[PDB]
Subunit: 189 residues, 4 copies
Amino acid sequence: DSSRRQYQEKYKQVEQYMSFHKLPADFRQKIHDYYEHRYQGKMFDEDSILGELNGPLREEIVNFNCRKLVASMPLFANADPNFVTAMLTKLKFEVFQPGDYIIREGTIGKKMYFIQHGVVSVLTEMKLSDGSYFGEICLLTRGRRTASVRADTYCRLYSLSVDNFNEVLEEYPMMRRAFETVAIDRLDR
Amino acid sequence: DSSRRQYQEKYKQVEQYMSFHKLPADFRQKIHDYYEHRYQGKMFDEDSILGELNGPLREEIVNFNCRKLVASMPLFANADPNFVTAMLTKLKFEVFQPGDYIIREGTIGKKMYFIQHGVVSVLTEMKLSDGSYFGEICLLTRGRRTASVRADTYCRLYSLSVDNFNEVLEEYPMMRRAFETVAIDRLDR
Amino acid sequence: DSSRRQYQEKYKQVEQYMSFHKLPADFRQKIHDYYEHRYQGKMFDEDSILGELNGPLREEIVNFNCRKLVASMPLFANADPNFVTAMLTKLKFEVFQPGDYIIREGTIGKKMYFIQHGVVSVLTEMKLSDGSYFGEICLLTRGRRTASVRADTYCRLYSLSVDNFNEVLEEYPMMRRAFETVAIDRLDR
Amino acid sequence: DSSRRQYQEKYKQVEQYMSFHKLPADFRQKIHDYYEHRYQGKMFDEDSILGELNGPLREEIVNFNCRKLVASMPLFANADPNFVTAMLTKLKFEVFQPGDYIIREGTIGKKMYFIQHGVVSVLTEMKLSDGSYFGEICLLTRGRRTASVRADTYCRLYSLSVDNFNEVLEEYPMMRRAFETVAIDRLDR
Ligand SMILES: Nc1ncnc2c1ncn2[C@@H]1O[C@@H]2COP(=O)(O)O[C@H]2[C@H]1O
Ligand SMILES: Nc1ncnc2c1ncn2[C@@H]1O[C@@H]2COP(=O)(O)O[C@H]2[C@H]1O
Ligand SMILES: Nc1ncnc2c1ncn2[C@@H]1O[C@@H]2COP(=O)(O)O[C@H]2[C@H]1O
Ligand SMILES: Nc1ncnc2c1ncn2[C@@H]1O[C@@H]2COP(=O)(O)O[C@H]2[C@H]1O
């Protein structure tokens, strides 16, 4: 239960930090809920652990932890396993809370998001859920966000930066077509 | 009180460090006073805490912690909330002590400062206080400091590097005019 | 036995991490075996220790820890001691398990491997063991891997990135010929 | 005595590390002596401590800790205090042991050394001591070391990288002449 204790002590610091800065009670509970949803009572120095392993072990772990995500998207499901692994390795797990603005219209976009679980509202009005992704337009155009995207419910997502996006596509150039298709179709709508 | 203990133990190391290097008694008290003013008896690995959160949570925290600063300046008060947030996110909190040279005339300037609280003396003689900023000239010209700026009283400031300054303005180009106006007006004087 | 305890507590976290993510029992034992083979019951913040030393001490340590490796290869054995040291300093120790894909054919190669102990199978069928190296072709061509290389037995290797490879050769340009010879000979086969 | 304990526990790890890698008894005592000379029974996360301070405090500390060094050289003694501070801030304290090769002839030089205390032998035969510096030729030519420099006695030095060297001179261009004079005079000899 060393991981449980790590979470408890770390959360104690967070609580004291919020108290020190006199954050409102409502925000403190929002923080409380975020930690439960995001870490679920346990914490590990993930970077330290994966860093002690080797490439093969790290790739098997990410492929397993993302099995759900992978199964939910034709993008990864029907692709070269090596492509999927390269992509998955670059993903960053993120949890957003109801009402959170994940993307704001008109700003410079430098990341896209893959939905593991949750519902988002795209407003320029439409919704996207499990197995869908968004924010790909700006990674392709390098322009400004074409719409705002807010979390409707709690959202468990994986983000990918434009730099990592292009890095992976350097090795798998033809996979860019998948994102472009989705981008074009949405730009038309 | 884990944060209180962190401060106490950390300060113990500092004291032992100053003793090891035989720093004068007067400087040791200056160090003592600095820690009280800067951390106020508590310490947190701020980077670790904010890093465990998400973008929305981090932005709400910085906007709240800087509410005072924001209210004191037409620059931020009357601007696009997204601009203010982008700027605030790049700021670095710093505390200076009476007599400290924040900026020395003739040197290459790579940062500007926003005054949360305190009084500074600009010498090439004038003073600046709460709600004012300085050091913007060099971020705009990339030249040498046009004057020295010393802390008159204890000063609670937020600094912004030229690189972060230009990064934010890449997204909000027109806000550069605000800094230029102040710069031009002061260059004339 | 502070190092033994470090290993035990660290492994406890790993085990809890694997449990948290519900990894299969078989993979958990694979992880168990990896840690035994790689760290052998002890762990040290190697980077912190070597960083407290100086250049001379670090170089003597790496030359000693790699004495076995050096003796097993004409490349290093008959070369300028300064070259060997520069190279050794850039190496990264890695342990692979039976069946592990060290290199996959057709992918972009950015590293080569020197075999301290173990047997690998090169498949485009041949094997390489103690004292041999592989993955040098892509560091020279900057192209795609000409074959896959799987660990046949447990493998104790030292990897070298293309960037560190070229950095060392900036100081020892003529040593590139050794790698080219091996590359040409294998490309012919 | 938290700093004393830090040293004791850290040294315990070092000793266990050397034992794990089966380093010879003679080298283990060399390591033992190095730690005593370099840290003197105490250790602090220097980077963490100085990082908690501000620019003014850090500059006063470095100027004080290097008071001895500064007094021993016309270079710094008769220069602009701001130049001295900028330089001192970039220095890295290093301890070398008798017989250590600080610089090897013919290699690419990327750093120079200022002697706080100790004696070095320059061999292409001459010696340099307290208040003198060496390794400046390569920082100026970007070529290969014109000679080897070995520690004759224990040496307490401060090194400066070519990059930091040129960075400081960007602000103080005319100080480069001081190093060139010494370089030219030695190249003639
Ligand atoms: N009509 C749409 N249907 C679904 N998603 C959309 C639609 N329009 C825009 N989006 C998504 O909203 C995202 C906003 O940021 P981007 O412009 O980078 O990428 C956009 C698309 O991923
Ligand atoms: N006349 C003035 N009134 C107020 N502030 C000034 C005046 N002159 C210079 N300053 C400030 O002092 C700063 C010194 O560094 P900079 O030249 O970067 O920017 C300068 C201005 O921000
Ligand atoms: N015929 C061969 N005999 C031994 N090794 C080979 C042979 N062919 C390829 N290899 C090695 O397998 C490696 C696969 O990655 P690279 O192409 O970078 O470099 C290749 C060589 O190092
Ligand atoms: N004749 C000399 N007298 C004193 N120092 C020297 C002499 N010749 C070379 N050196 C120093 O030895 C250093 C070796 O590395 P560098 O060539 O970078 O710079 C050299 C000088 O700093």
